[PDB]
Amino acid sequence: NADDQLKQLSALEGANGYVIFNESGIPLKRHEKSISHEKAVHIAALVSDLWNVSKKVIQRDLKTPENDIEVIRLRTKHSYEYIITQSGDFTMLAIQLCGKAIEEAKKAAAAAAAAAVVQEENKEKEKK
Amino acid sequence: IAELSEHSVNTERVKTGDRGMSHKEGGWPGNVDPNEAQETGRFKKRIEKS
């Protein structure tokens, strides 16, 4: 059941990886494409500092009572997108790409497949 | 000439202890061990049990 959500996140177009953070900062589950645990430990520390600072800043720095940030989306260079949503005590980071980025990724995958096929052909030739 | 006695007094030097530690591992509970795979794996399963 829980495993299916990770598969569902991958299924959505423009999604690279999903990282989930506990209140302590331990990464519950991360995507296989992205680095597992080492990247999660590095991503969890940065998001907690950002989410905590933003949550604290909105309440006091903007002088607005009972105002809480719900979703933070950071758009950077190339196709990077990092939507952050907090549910209960768990906050996760999702990395999605634009249409051009997705096309580039598909092209790269195709190239990799072609390379693998070429290697297989070479092996067959060597066997012959 | 009065008798002379020599006494040496040195101010106490605060002790200096050299200890080296690595904070590269991410924050974890004290009971759990970050390096051990078994401690981390059991803890993650407990969190997803909600």
Coordinates of C-alpha atoms in Angstrom, one line a residue:
Chain A
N1 CA 0.0 0.0 0.0
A2 CA 2.7 2.5 1.1
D3 CA 5.0 1.2 -1.6
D4 CA 2.4 2.0 -4.3
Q5 CA 2.5 5.8 -3.5
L6 CA 6.3 5.8 -4.4
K7 CA 5.4 4.0 -7.7
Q8 CA 2.5 6.5 -8.3
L9 CA 4.9 9.5 -7.8
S10 CA 7.3 8.1 -10.5
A11 CA 4.2 7.5 -12.8
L12 CA 3.3 11.2 -12.8
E13 CA 5.0 13.0 -15.8
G14 CA 7.8 15.5 -14.9
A15 CA 8.6 13.7 -11.6
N16 CA 12.3 12.8 -11.0
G17 CA 12.3 11.8 -7.3
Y18 CA 10.4 12.0 -3.9
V19 CA 12.0 12.4 -0.5
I20 CA 10.1 12.2 2.9
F21 CA 11.4 13.8 6.1
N22 CA 10.4 13.0 9.7
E23 CA 10.2 15.7 12.5
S24 CA 13.7 14.5 13.7
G25 CA 15.0 14.8 10.1
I26 CA 15.5 11.1 9.3
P27 CA 14.5 10.4 5.6
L28 CA 11.7 7.8 5.6
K29 CA 11.7 6.9 1.9
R30 CA 13.6 8.3 -1.1
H31 CA 13.5 7.5 -4.9
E32 CA 16.0 5.0 -6.4
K33 CA 17.0 7.2 -9.4
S34 CA 18.2 9.9 -6.9
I35 CA 20.9 9.0 -4.4
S36 CA 19.4 7.0 -1.4
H37 CA 20.2 8.1 2.2
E38 CA 23.4 10.1 1.5
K39 CA 21.3 12.6 -0.7
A40 CA 18.3 12.2 1.7
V41 CA 20.5 13.1 4.7
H42 CA 21.8 16.2 2.8
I43 CA 18.3 17.1 1.4
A44 CA 16.5 16.7 4.8
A45 CA 18.9 19.1 6.6
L46 CA 18.5 21.9 4.0
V47 CA 14.6 21.6 3.8
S48 CA 14.2 21.6 7.6
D49 CA 16.3 24.8 7.9
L50 CA 14.3 26.4 5.0
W51 CA 10.9 25.1 6.2
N52 CA 11.5 26.0 9.8
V53 CA 12.9 29.5 8.9
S54 CA 10.0 30.2 6.5
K55 CA 7.4 29.0 9.0
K56 CA 8.9 31.1 11.8
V57 CA 9.4 34.1 9.5
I58 CA 5.8 34.2 8.3
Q59 CA 4.4 34.2 11.9
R60 CA 6.7 37.0 13.2
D61 CA 8.6 38.7 10.4
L62 CA 5.5 39.4 8.3
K63 CA 3.5 40.2 11.6
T64 CA 0.5 38.1 10.5
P65 CA -1.2 36.1 13.3
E66 CA -2.1 32.4 12.7
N67 CA -0.6 32.4 9.1
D68 CA 1.2 29.1 8.2
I69 CA 3.0 28.2 4.9
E70 CA 1.3 25.2 3.1
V71 CA 3.5 24.6 0.0
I72 CA 6.9 26.0 -1.0
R73 CA 8.0 25.7 -4.7
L74 CA 11.5 26.7 -5.8
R75 CA 12.1 27.0 -9.5
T76 CA 15.8 27.1 -10.5
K77 CA 18.0 26.8 -13.7
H78 CA 17.2 24.1 -16.3
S79 CA 14.2 21.9 -15.4
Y80 CA 14.7 21.7 -11.6
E81 CA 11.5 22.2 -9.5
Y82 CA 11.3 21.3 -5.8
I83 CA 7.7 21.5 -4.4
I84 CA 7.6 21.0 -0.6
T85 CA 4.4 19.8 1.2
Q86 CA 4.1 19.1 4.9
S87 CA 1.5 16.5 6.2
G88 CA 1.3 15.9 10.0
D89 CA 4.9 15.7 11.3
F90 CA 6.3 14.5 7.8
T91 CA 7.5 17.0 5.1
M92 CA 8.7 15.7 1.7
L93 CA 10.6 17.2 -1.3
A94 CA 9.5 16.4 -4.9
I95 CA 11.8 17.0 -7.9
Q96 CA 10.0 17.4 -11.3
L97 CA 11.2 18.7 -14.7
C98 CA 9.8 20.7 -17.6
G99 CA 8.7 19.4 -20.9
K100 CA 12.1 20.1 -22.6
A101 CA 13.9 18.5 -19.6
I102 CA 11.7 15.4 -19.9
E103 CA 12.3 15.1 -23.6
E104 CA 16.1 15.4 -22.9
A105 CA 15.8 12.7 -20.3
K106 CA 14.0 10.4 -22.7
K107 CA 16.6 11.0 -25.4
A108 CA 19.3 10.1 -22.9
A109 CA 17.5 6.9 -21.9
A110 CA 17.2 6.0 -25.6
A111 CA 20.9 6.7 -26.1
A112 CA 21.7 4.5 -23.2
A113 CA 19.6 1.7 -24.6
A114 CA 21.3 2.0 -28.0
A115 CA 24.7 1.8 -26.3
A116 CA 23.6 -1.3 -24.4
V117 CA 22.4 -2.9 -27.7
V118 CA 25.7 -2.0 -29.3
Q119 CA 27.6 -3.6 -26.4
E120 CA 25.5 -6.8 -26.8
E121 CA 26.2 -6.9 -30.5
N122 CA 29.9 -6.6 -29.8
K123 CA 29.7 -9.4 -27.3
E124 CA 27.9 -11.6 -29.8
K125 CA 30.6 -10.8 -32.4
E126 CA 33.3 -11.7 -29.9
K127 CA 31.5 -15.0 -29.2
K128 CA 31.3 -15.7 -32.9
Chain B
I1 CA 72.2 37.4 57.3
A2 CA 68.8 35.7 57.8
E3 CA 68.5 32.0 56.7
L4 CA 67.1 31.7 53.1
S5 CA 64.6 29.0 52.0
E6 CA 63.6 28.6 48.3
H7 CA 60.0 27.7 47.4
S8 CA 58.6 27.3 43.9
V9 CA 54.9 28.2 43.2
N10 CA 53.3 27.7 39.7
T11 CA 49.8 28.8 38.8
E12 CA 47.5 25.8 38.0
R13 CA 47.2 25.2 34.2
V14 CA 43.7 24.4 33.1
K15 CA 43.7 20.9 31.6
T16 CA 43.6 20.6 27.8
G17 CA 42.0 17.5 26.3
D18 CA 42.2 16.8 22.5
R19 CA 39.1 14.9 21.1
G20 CA 38.3 14.5 17.4
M21 CA 34.7 13.6 16.2
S22 CA 32.9 13.5 12.8
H23 CA 29.4 15.1 12.3
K24 CA 29.2 14.0 8.6
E25 CA 26.5 11.4 9.6
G26 CA 22.9 12.9 9.7
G27 CA 21.1 13.5 12.9
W28 CA 19.8 10.3 14.5
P29 CA 18.4 9.1 17.9
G30 CA 21.2 8.3 20.5
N31 CA 19.9 4.7 21.0
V32 CA 20.2 4.0 17.2
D33 CA 23.6 3.8 15.5
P34 CA 24.0 5.7 12.2
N35 CA 26.9 3.5 10.8
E36 CA 25.0 0.2 11.5
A37 CA 22.5 -0.6 8.7
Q38 CA 20.5 -2.9 11.0
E39 CA 19.8 -0.1 13.6
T40 CA 18.7 2.4 10.9
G41 CA 16.5 -0.2 9.0
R42 CA 14.6 -1.3 12.1
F43 CA 14.0 2.4 13.1
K44 CA 12.6 3.3 9.7
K45 CA 10.1 0.3 9.8
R46 CA 8.9 1.4 13.3
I47 CA 8.1 5.0 12.0
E48 CA 5.9 3.6 9.3
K49 CA 3.5 1.7 11.7
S50 CA 0.1 7.0 11.1

